[PDB]
Design an enzyme around this catalytic site. Structure first.
Site, short mmCIF file in Angstrom:
data_model
loop_
_atom_site.label_atom_id
_atom_site.label_comp_id
_atom_site.label_asym_id
_atom_site.label_seq_id
_atom_site.Cartn_x
_atom_site.Cartn_y
_atom_site.Cartn_z
N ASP A 242 11.85 -85.34 -35.68
CA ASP A 242 11.17 -86.11 -34.64
C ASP A 242 10.22 -85.22 -33.84
O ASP A 242 9.12 -85.65 -33.48
CB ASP A 242 12.20 -86.84 -33.81
CG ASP A 242 11.67 -87.70 -32.68
OD1 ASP A 242 11.19 -87.10 -31.68
OD2 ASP A 242 11.82 -88.95 -32.80
N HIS A 243 10.61 -83.96 -33.63
CA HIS A 243 9.88 -82.98 -32.87
C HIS A 243 8.72 -82.39 -33.67
O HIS A 243 7.91 -81.68 -33.08
CB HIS A 243 10.86 -81.94 -32.27
CG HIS A 243 11.78 -82.53 -31.26
ND1 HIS A 243 12.59 -81.76 -30.47
CD2 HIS A 243 12.08 -83.83 -30.95
CE1 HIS A 243 13.32 -82.56 -29.70
NE2 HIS A 243 13.02 -83.81 -29.98
N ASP A 244 8.64 -82.69 -34.98
CA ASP A 244 7.46 -82.46 -35.79
C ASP A 244 6.44 -83.60 -35.66
O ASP A 244 5.28 -83.36 -35.92
CB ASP A 244 7.87 -82.17 -37.23
CG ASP A 244 6.86 -81.46 -38.12
OD1 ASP A 244 5.65 -81.50 -37.78
OD2 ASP A 244 7.30 -80.88 -39.14
C1 HEM Z 1 20.65 -83.84 -29.55
C2 HEM Z 1 20.28 -84.52 -28.50
C3 HEM Z 1 19.19 -85.47 -28.16
C4 HEM Z 1 18.78 -85.65 -26.83
C5 HEM Z 1 19.33 -84.93 -25.62
C6 HEM Z 1 17.75 -86.56 -26.85
C7 HEM Z 1 17.10 -86.98 -25.74
C8 HEM Z 1 15.94 -87.71 -25.68
C9 HEM Z 1 15.25 -87.99 -24.54
C10 HEM Z 1 15.66 -87.55 -23.15
C11 HEM Z 1 14.17 -88.73 -24.91
C12 HEM Z 1 13.17 -89.33 -23.97
C13 HEM Z 1 13.75 -90.57 -23.28
C14 HEM Z 1 12.76 -91.38 -22.44
O1 HEM Z 1 12.18 -92.37 -22.95
O2 HEM Z 1 12.56 -90.98 -21.29
C15 HEM Z 1 14.25 -88.91 -26.28
C16 HEM Z 1 13.35 -89.48 -27.13
C17 HEM Z 1 13.27 -89.43 -28.52
N1 HEM Z 1 14.33 -89.22 -29.33
FE1 HEM Z 1 16.09 -88.21 -28.74
N2 HEM Z 1 17.51 -87.03 -28.10
C18 HEM Z 1 18.42 -86.35 -28.90
C19 HEM Z 1 18.54 -86.55 -30.27
C20 HEM Z 1 17.71 -87.32 -31.09
C21 HEM Z 1 17.92 -87.58 -32.45
C22 HEM Z 1 19.12 -87.18 -33.26
C23 HEM Z 1 16.84 -88.37 -32.87
C24 HEM Z 1 16.51 -88.90 -34.18
C25 HEM Z 1 17.02 -88.78 -35.34
C26 HEM Z 1 16.01 -88.53 -31.75
C27 HEM Z 1 14.74 -89.19 -31.69
C28 HEM Z 1 13.88 -89.33 -30.60
C29 HEM Z 1 12.55 -89.62 -30.59
C30 HEM Z 1 11.66 -89.81 -31.79
C31 HEM Z 1 12.14 -89.64 -29.28
C32 HEM Z 1 10.74 -89.89 -28.78
C33 HEM Z 1 9.85 -88.66 -28.79
C34 HEM Z 1 8.51 -88.81 -28.07
O3 HEM Z 1 8.36 -88.43 -26.88
O4 HEM Z 1 7.61 -89.34 -28.71
N3 HEM Z 1 16.58 -87.92 -30.64
N4 HEM Z 1 15.34 -88.27 -26.75
N1 LIG Z 2 14.91 -83.70 -26.58
C1 LIG Z 2 14.51 -83.93 -25.50
SE1 LIG Z 2 13.97 -84.25 -23.81
CA LIG Z 3 3.61 -82.34 -37.05
#
Ligand code: HEM
Ligand SMILES: N#C[Se-]
Ligand SMILES: [Ca+2]
Ligand SMILES: *[C@@H]1O[C@H](CO[C@@H]2O[C@@H](C)[C@@H](O)[C@@H](O)[C@@H]2O)[C@@H](O[C@@H]2O[C@H](CO)[C@@H](O[C@@H]3O[C@H](CO[C@H]4O[C@H](CO)[C@@H](O)[C@H](O)[C@@H]4O)[C@@H](O)[C@H](O)[C@@H]3O)[C@H](O)[C@H]2NC(C)=O)[C@H](O)[C@H]1NC(C)=O
Ligand SMILES: *[C@@H]1O[C@H](CO[C@@H]2O[C@@H](C)[C@@H](O)[C@@H](O)[C@@H]2O)[C@@H](O[C@@H]2O[C@H](CO)[C@@H](O[C@@H]3O[C@H](CO[C@H]4O[C@H](CO)[C@@H](O)[C@H](O)[C@@H]4O)[C@@H](O)[C@H](O)[C@@H]3O)[C@H](O)[C@H]2NC(C)=O)[C@H](O)[C@H]1NC(C)=O
Ligand code: HEM
Ligand SMILES: *[C@@H]1O[C@H](CO)[C@@H](O)[C@H](O)[C@H]1NC(C)=O
Ligand SMILES: *[C@@H]1O[C@H](CO)[C@@H](O)[C@H](O)[C@H]1NC(C)=O
Ligand SMILES: *[C@@H]1O[C@H](CO)[C@@H](O)[C@H](O)[C@H]1NC(C)=O
Ligand SMILES: *[C@@H]1O[C@H](CO)[C@@H](O)[C@H](O)[C@H]1NC(C)=O
Ligand SMILES: N#C[Se-]
Ligand SMILES: N#C[Se-]
Ligand SMILES: N#C[Se-]
Ligand SMILES: N#C[Se-]
Ligand SMILES: N#C[Se-]
Ligand SMILES: N#C[Se-]
Ligand SMILES: N#C[Se-]
Ligand SMILES: N#C[Se-]
Ligand SMILES: N#C[Se-]
Ligand SMILES: N#C[Se-]
Ligand SMILES: N#C[Se-]
Ligand SMILES: N#C[Se-]
Ligand SMILES: N#C[Se-]
Ligand SMILES: N#C[Se-]
Ligand SMILES: N#C[Se-]
Ligand SMILES: N#C[Se-]
Ligand SMILES: N#C[Se-]
Ligand SMILES: N#C[Se-]
Ligand SMILES: N#C[Se-]
Ligand SMILES: N#C[Se-]
Ligand SMILES: N#C[Se-]
Ligand SMILES: N#C[Se-]
Ligand SMILES: N#C[Se-]
Ligand SMILES: N#C[Se-]
Ligand SMILES: N#C[Se-]
Ligand SMILES: N#C[Se-]
Ligand SMILES: N#C[Se-]
Ligand SMILES: N#C[Se-]
Ligand SMILES: N#C[Se-]
Ligand SMILES: N#C[Se-]
Ligand SMILES: N#C[Se-]
Ligand SMILES: [Ca+2]
Lengths: 465, 57, 105, 464, 105, 58
Positions: free
Chosen positions: C94-96
């Site tokens: 996701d971070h990619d």
């Molecule tokens: C391992 C721990 C994980 C978190 C701690 C975490 C937290 C977040 C937060 C705080 C956001 C933003 C929330 C908001 O709308 O204010 C968030 C967004 C996204 N996630 Fe999270 N996440 C954790 C773990 C995962 C895993 C396992 C994911 C997918 C397989 C996953 C996905 C995503 C995605 C795509 C986002 C949005 C990213 C963006 O800013 O575009 N996360 N997560």
């Molecule tokens: N992963 C996050 Se804010």
């Molecule tokens: Ca990328």
């Protein structure tokens, strides 16, 4: 403003608190929320839309960065070895840690105050958010330097720029292979994988590779996989005493734990030999993210599921039925029809009590509510959205690893040997790793093999006369 | 803007009398892209962004 | 965009030669459907007290979490056929792909 | 200032002049061009896009206006008869003309200076651009007032607001029926019509009814239909003396000709009994628009085809092959392949000489180059774009005339009797009009009938 | 948007209740493809002297018109099956659908 | 808004001594939507935008 205020004034959209909340007894309080930056700030004409700060491509931009200044700051510029910069104060039993970042407001410092360990610097700003995440960032840093080292030995005339790019291109390919060969089949399941990711033909410059706004919310399905602890295991895959099972509310931004509680190896072993949480319809998400998200570094514990739903509203996302229709799936109107679609009348009743119609169900909530495709961990809606996104990222990527001209046919034969277990063997003190697909293998010793049994990446076809 | 802790090691290379002249110019060039055009600019930026620079005399 | 090149740019610029911002950083998301805002163009559902969505009250996101998502965490079902590394790769991946910026306070 | 300067500075994108131009010998000159307004002005981040100032819907907003202040200004607010405002200084043998607009720089005044007749005011700003257009605007104004009057007689209790809306709804339906029953089949031809506009089911709220950027350029295929003269005919469909054939370069913004050279009837007869220009591959567009566009009201004669191509670049429109692929049509790579696609290797060679690949061919130029579908006046590419646009406008319109709840089943039976000839009979001094489809019928007397033979709109089901 | 209504609004607002600007006036066009600009996001092809489009020189609009569009107007072919009213309904219809604003003076 | 030529005829209705009371209110309200709140506002706007209003002066 939005961090401490419960006033609803632009750009703040705080989540109000219901009566008889199980945690937040004070109804005058709120969960903080800043609305995502608009593409066209201040406009009355445009329909508001958000920005992706990263490259949509599967290019390991979480390692290398998505902007030119960051990308050079992440590099070791003191020599021509083509390396990523590494921590100058700490190592992990002799191996590289990520460099430290310099933030004006560093959340990581607030986790253990006596320790004074700031957040790490990486291609993406969130690398410190869980130590498990940090460990994976650190793994890939090491793998870059390993590859750059090996290529230097293979091609002594190559300069730092050439070494960095060639290593970078390899890491990119490894992320793409693990993603599409190992990871996505276990997300989608075979039926949806065949449907949304048919066999690669060739690069198509008319496939739009942008991230869709909806994917930013849909792909948060993974929040249902989260386990309420960080598990650390010793070299016998036993609990690493004293703190083998840390509550997640005590690991968020806890960069000190990587540096001072024994590096990445115990975390990676935990990742390998612990199950994920199963998403069930009556067990959607754990209280460590629902009640205690980031409670160590902030005035109040956030609710990640609630944030997801607030965020979909912020981004102007259509509701469940509009996305079902988009995907060519039936749109339930009644509680009974939603019962059929969810194979769960009780959940259907709950959703209708909250939302009144399935038209208004927030995409994440609706997505994660659907029963899972056979051998996948999403239902049909999420599989359509996620599958469609990743097809576009492959077919619309000029540098996709299989595309004619990106690698030689020999480099491709070599890259097909890669696996995540091998990467772990090559860059840690771990000598026993998950077999199979790493993503299914979860039980020591049954699912484990010695590192010696695994084929290494042969870089001989990167030799240049 | 912020000076990064690992960039302190570059200050060492630039001051190492025996460091290669090409090696120093690649670092000088790196710091020039960030608006830091002498070693004195580099050391002063590191000071302002919070680092102990007292070991440079 | 250069006519020949060998490596990806850092920003993603020039991946698509006919439309060179596509998939590059610091650009608007693509939308697969028209956006749904309280006012048509800007304000999220739930912003204005008393404004319904499609003829129904907007549910507090925290209430939906309370009523639908919450469960006794000690009854968690472990996944026999997935490691925790399976979740971790998802977040790393996701971070990619996406980070959506918000205003600094 | 884009009108006088040849400097390329925002917001000006003047068309440069090639060597050996047949008109503009001076390469330091230019054809003026202002870039369309950006949706997000000044932005680093956004991908530039343009604005539609009108309602996308087929709702007769060219009569009623697309903004609420203009919509009020177009109405007669001195009574409760529900009428559109009419000219207060001039009539056309007793009938309504459009009111005059008040523009700070009025181009219509520059056509005939002694005449001092300004541009008309209508729902859309371009009503004066050619008098044939003005005549059609005037016809619909009249039709509204006629309907409002008839409904007042039918429903004496109805206030001005109710009368205006009910008439407006009818005029909206008439524009929709003429467009989809009579006009579009003759653009697309039967195959494409069936393909892009299958029989209406119902309103679908997931069909996006916005105008696509490309349609603004693709629908300028109509520039190929334009004839170099305005034709005026008397009540026997003979030339209206002394000036039966005005060159187009002398009718642009020539509002005085409607007012002073005998109103809309001679123009409408000309429209009915003159053929359109055929688009042919060696005869794409006429020199009155290619060399002398708006030459009476501007420093230099514009080039409407060249403007179209410049405008597609301004709008960031992809080239021909990208649109072929979008439409599911073969994309020719070589001059030989483009020859097959155009049935014309000579034209293919000329296009490749200018553009270098069929990828870079501007959408208008490529669109209008293609041979025409059987019984249509566009080729496959333009048929796809145009057909797709109009399907969205129908199916994504909650007020489409066939949609359940817009009209009663009786009103629908009544509206199905409407036709453009009938509207002309009802609002002009013309008593003989085109038969059949008005858009095919083009030859007096063969294609003509007496007005009394045509079925009127029966408003009985609007009784209350 | 009112939950019941009887007539079209003037602006087109509220025709689509879930996304009420859709088809309304003074809004951006929808794009059916990604945009193609010289710089990726803003500048038209032919803006910058010497900048090619997809490997090929940009052709002056006026040159294309001269070599392709121009014909001797004495050669004009009348359409046996279309009235001039056929072109005029096109333009009037166009004026119900789209007007693209520019800056003035 | 520029003053429009047909709006001159409204000034006549407002001055027609025998014009209906509701009819005048209709027009008063129409000019008020524009920010023209007296007949002096109406006739001065008509002056500046080009039209002769001396033909009404009582
Ligand atoms: C391992 C721990 C994980 C978190 C701690 C975490 C937290 C977040 C937060 C705080 C956001 C933003 C929330 C908001 O709308 O204010 C968030 C967004 C996204 N996630 Fe999270 N996440 C954790 C773990 C995962 C895993 C396992 C994911 C997918 C397989 C996953 C996905 C995503 C995605 C795509 C986002 C949005 C990213 C963006 O800013 O575009 N996360 N997560
Ligand atoms: N992963 C996050 Se804010
Ligand atoms: Ca990328
Ligand atoms: C109401 O109308 C909508 C919209 O219909 C479209 O426009 C009208 C004018 C007609 O031309 C239709 O033929 C058009 O479809 C209909 O919804 C669409 O339904 C189709 C069929 O189920 C959906 O298509 C599917 O889309 C899936 C997702 O991928 C698509 O989008 C991606 C992203 O851009 C794109 O890459 C891809 O190529 C797809 O187009 C896909 O998995 C699947 O195979 C199939 O293509 C379409 O997405 C729906 N659109 C919307 C806006 O919801 C309704 O069916 C219709 N209902 C009724 C009762 O008439
Ligand atoms: C290269 O890839 C493009 C894009 O392919 C899409 O995305 C990839 C990831 C795959 O998932 C494909 O399945 C997707 O289609 C291909 O071009 C597309 O080809 C299809 C089929 O020829 C085109 O679809 C046609 O569209 C016509 C126009 O209407 C469409 O758009 C309107 C408005 O958005 C919409 O309302 C309507 O419903 C349609 O979606 C339509 O008349 C016709 O019946 C047919 O559906 C599609 O539009 C093309 N897209 C683009 C961006 O060009 C190439 O074919 C492919 N080439 C290879 C692999 O060589
Ligand atoms: C007497 C007939 C016609 C003209 C005179 C005329 C002129 C123009 C001009 C000047 C433009 C703008 C050029 C630019 O890019 O600056 C223009 C645009 C459009 N046309 Fe034209 N046109 C006459 C006739 C027709 C016919 C018969 C058409 C269709 C069947 C037709 C279409 C259009 C369209 C849709 C546009 C763009 C509108 C917009 O502003 O979005 N025209 N025309
Ligand atoms: C650069 O590489 C050298 C050699 O490996 C190492 O000693 C030095 O610390 C590195 N500098 C960084 C990572 O900032
Ligand atoms: C915090 O870090 C210190 C020093 O690194 C360590 O000894 C301690 O146990 C950690 N635990 C706390 C206080 O949370
Ligand atoms: C309004 O209608 C009346 C009655 O038909 C007419 O006398 C008057 O001229 C009209 N005024 C305008 C501005 O159209
Ligand atoms: C100009 O207008 C007057 C009307 O006042 C008319 O008599 C004259 O013939 C017109 N001139 C031309 C060039 O037709
Ligand atoms: N930004 C806002 Se509401
Ligand atoms: N505990 C509870 Se509901
Ligand atoms: N942003 C825009 Se249109
Ligand atoms: N020490 C460091 Se980055
Ligand atoms: N754990 C801690 Se401070
Ligand atoms: N770096 C290089 Se070619
Ligand atoms: N193997 C693969 Se993607
Ligand atoms: N392919 C699969 Se699971
Ligand atoms: N920290 C712990 Se258990
Ligand atoms: N918060 C804490 Se320890
Ligand atoms: N959030 C905080 Se303090
Ligand atoms: N839709 C359904 Se069951
Ligand atoms: N509710 C549920 Se399962
Ligand atoms: N392995 C390492 Se640095
Ligand atoms: N993606 C979206 Se709306
Ligand atoms: N509605 C929209 Se983009
Ligand atoms: N804890 C609970 Se439901
Ligand atoms: N506006 C411009 Se280039
Ligand atoms: N029609 C016009 Se400018
Ligand atoms: N009802 C009405 Se206008
Ligand atoms: N379709 C029709 Se009228
Ligand atoms: N000559 C003529 Se109409
Ligand atoms: N133009 C031609 Se053949
Ligand atoms: N021949 C062809 Se595309
Ligand atoms: N195919 C064709 Se034109
Ligand atoms: N030469 C030519 Se087109
Ligand atoms: N086509 C014919 Se005749
Ligand atoms: N159109 C015809 Se024959
Ligand atoms: N329509 C378009 Se790009
Ligand atoms: N590229 C685009 Se919109
Ligand atoms: N005469 C007039 Se508006
Ligand atoms: Ca309209």
């Amino acid at each position: 403003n939005c961090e401490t205020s419960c006033v609803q004034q632009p750009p703040c959209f705080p989540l109000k608190i219901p009566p008889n909340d199980p945690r937040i007894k004070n109804q005058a309080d709120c969960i903080p929320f800043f609305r995502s930056c608009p593409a066209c700030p201040g406009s009355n004409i445009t329909i508001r839309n958000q920005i992706n700060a990263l490259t949509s491509f599967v290019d390991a931009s979480m390692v290398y960065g998505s902007e030119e200044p960051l990308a050079r700051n992440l590099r070791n510029m003191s020599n021509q070895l083509g390396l990523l910069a590494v921590n100058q104060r700490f190592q992990d039993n002799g191996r590289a840690l990520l460099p430290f970042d310099n933030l004006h407001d560093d959340p990581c410092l607030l986790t253990n105050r006596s320790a004074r360990i700031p957040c790490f610097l990486a291609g993406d700003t969130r690398s410190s958010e869980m130590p498990e995440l940090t460990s994976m960032h650190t793994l890939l840093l090491r793998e870059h330097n390993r590859l750059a080292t090996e290529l230097k030995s293979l091609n002594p005339r190559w300069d730092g720029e050439r070494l960095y790019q060639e290593a970078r291109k390899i890491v990119g390919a490894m992320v793409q292979i693990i993603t599409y060969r190992d990871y996505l089949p276990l997300v989608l399941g075979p039926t949806a994988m065949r449907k949304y990711l048919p066999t690669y033909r060739s690069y198509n410059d008319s496939v739009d590779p942008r991230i869709a706004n909806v994917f930013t919310n849909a792909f948060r399905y993974g929040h249902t996989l989260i386990q309420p602890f960080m598990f650390r295991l010793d070299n016998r895959y036993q609990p690493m005493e004293p703190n083998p099972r840390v509550p997640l509310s005590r690991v968020f931004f806890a960069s000190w734990r990587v540096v001072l509680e024994g590096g990445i190896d115990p975390i990676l072993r935990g990742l390998m030999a612990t199950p994920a949480k199963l998403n069930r319809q009556n067990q959607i998400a754990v209280d460590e993210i629902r009640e205690r998200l980031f409670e160590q570094v902030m005035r109040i514990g956030l609710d990640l599921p609630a944030l997801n739903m607030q965020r979909s509203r912020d981004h102007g996302l259509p509701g469940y039925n509009a996305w079902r229709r988009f995907c060519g799936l039936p749109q339930p109107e009644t509680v009974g029809q939603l019962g059929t679609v969810l194979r769960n009348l009780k959940l259907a009743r709950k959703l209708m009590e909250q939302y009144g119609t399935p038209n208004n169900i927030d995409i994440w909530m609706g997505g994660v509510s659907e029963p899972l495709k056979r051998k996948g961990r999403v239902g049909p809606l999420l599989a359509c959205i996620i599958g469609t996104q990743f097809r576009k990222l492959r077919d619309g990527d000029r540098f996709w690893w299989e595309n004619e001209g990106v690698f030689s046919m020999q480099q491709r034969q070599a890259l097909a040997q890669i696996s995540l277990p091998r990467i772990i063997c090559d860059n840690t003190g771990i000598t026993t790793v998950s077999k199979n697909n790493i993503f299914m293998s979860n039980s020591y010793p049954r699912d484990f093999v010695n590192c010696s049994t695994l084929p290494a990446l042969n870089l001989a076809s990167w030799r240049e006369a | 803007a912020n000076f990064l802790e690992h960039e302190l090691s570059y200050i060492d290379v630039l001051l190492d009398k025996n460091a290669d002249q090409a090696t120093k110019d690649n670092l000088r060039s790196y710091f020039a892209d960030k608006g830091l055009h002498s070693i004195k600019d580099i050391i002063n930026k590191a000071k302002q962004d919070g680092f102990d620079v007292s070991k440079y005399e | 965009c250069p006519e020949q090149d060998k490596y990806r740019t850092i920003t993603g610029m020039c991946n698509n030669r006919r439309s060179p911002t596509l998939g590059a950083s610091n650009r608007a998301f693509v939308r697969w459907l028209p956006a749904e805002y309280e006012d048509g163009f800007s304000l999220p559902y739930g912003w204005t007290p008393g404004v319904k969505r499609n003829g129904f009250p907007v549910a507090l996101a925290r209430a939906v979490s309370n009523e639908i998502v919450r469960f006794p965490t000690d009854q968690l079902t472990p996944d026999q056929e997935r490691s925790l590394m399976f979740m971790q790769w998802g977040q790393l991946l996701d971070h990619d792909l996406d980070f959506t910026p918000e205003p600094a306070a």
